[PDB]
């Protein structure tokens, strides 16, 4: 039936997800429990460990808070490219209006970054540089303001979100559902977007049944978190309004500028 077309969708999306993103939640969780036979991540808990850790972290090439925040930017910019490549794999996404493609990504990417960033997070800290590093939550709190407050809400959201014990195959459709948001400010031709999202939501529903109990209630939980996201995305962009003025010295990445342009 059409219940077969939905498993095809979920499996096509999952394959795009594996290929588009370097590190799956599967591996990320393995690393975070030491359970992996792979080498341990260099643990960063203070400036000393950061300065010793420059070795095992994808380099950049002057203040530690600003240097750490500068690390997030390059990671975010790589994520936007991985997310943009994945969106292109969502059946009918590239057939949409190229202005609507830009709009869906503009608003979608930070919500998906935070969804996927939870995969790398526990209460104690965050896997960075594709699992080669582990930056502690306490250390990130210890940064001078406004940089101290930069990643706490992401930690807060991740501990709630990780509750739902979703898998990669759940996350592939979920993030596809987040991109295909009909209600994004500035969208020209909504109904084609809203059509696709209905398809993805059916596939998400089916996927969640075949993998979890209290499915409608999980599926329900998972669609309210989808607004917990827009919250922390709004909160995040205000903190960057703060940082753009209060820290005139440090510059923002041109791609991160294209996105935050007229955002909330």
């Amino acid at each position: 039936p059409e219940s077969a077309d939905l498993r095809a969708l979920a499996k096509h999306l999952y394959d795009s997800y594996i290929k588009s993103f370097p590190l799956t939640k599967a591996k990320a969780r393995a690393i975070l429990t030491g359970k992996t036979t792979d080498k341990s991540p260099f643990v960063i808990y203070d400036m000393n460990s950061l300065m010793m850790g420059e070795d095992k972290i994808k380099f950049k090439h002057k203040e530690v808070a600003i240097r750490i925040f500068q690390g997030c930017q390059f990671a975010s910019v790589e994520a936007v490219q991985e997310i943009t490549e994945y969106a292109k794999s969502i059946p009918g996404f590239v057939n949409l209006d190229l202005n609507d493609q830009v709009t869906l990504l503009k608003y979608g990417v930070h919500e998906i970054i935070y969804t996927m960033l939870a995969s790398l997070m526990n209460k104690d800290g965050v896997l960075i540089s594709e699992g080669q590093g582990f930056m502690t939550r306490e250390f990130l709190k210890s940064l001078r303001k406004p940089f101290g407050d930069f990643m706490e809400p992401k930690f807060e959201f991740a501990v709630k979100f990780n509750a739902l014990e979703l898998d990669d195959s759940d996350l592939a459709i979920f993030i596809a559902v987040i991109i295909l948001s009909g209600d994004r400010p500035g969208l020209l031709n909504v109904k084609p977007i809203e059509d696709i999202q209905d398809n993805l939501l059916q596939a998400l529903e089916l996927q969640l049944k075949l993998n979890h109990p209290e499915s409608s209630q999980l599926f329900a939980k998972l669609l309210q978190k989808m607004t917990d996201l827009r919250q922390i995305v709004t909160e995040h962009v205000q903190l960057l309004q703060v940082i753009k003025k209060t820290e005139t010295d440090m510059s923002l990445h041109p791609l991160l500028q294209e996105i935050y342009k007229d955002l909330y």
Binding site: Q81, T84, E85, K88, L98, Q101, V102, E258, K261
Partner: peptide
């Protein structure tokens, strides 16, 4: 406006 986004999409 949105030059790099356009580039990455049409890429």
């Amino acid at each position: 406006r949105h030059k790099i986004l356009h580039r990455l999409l049409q890429e």
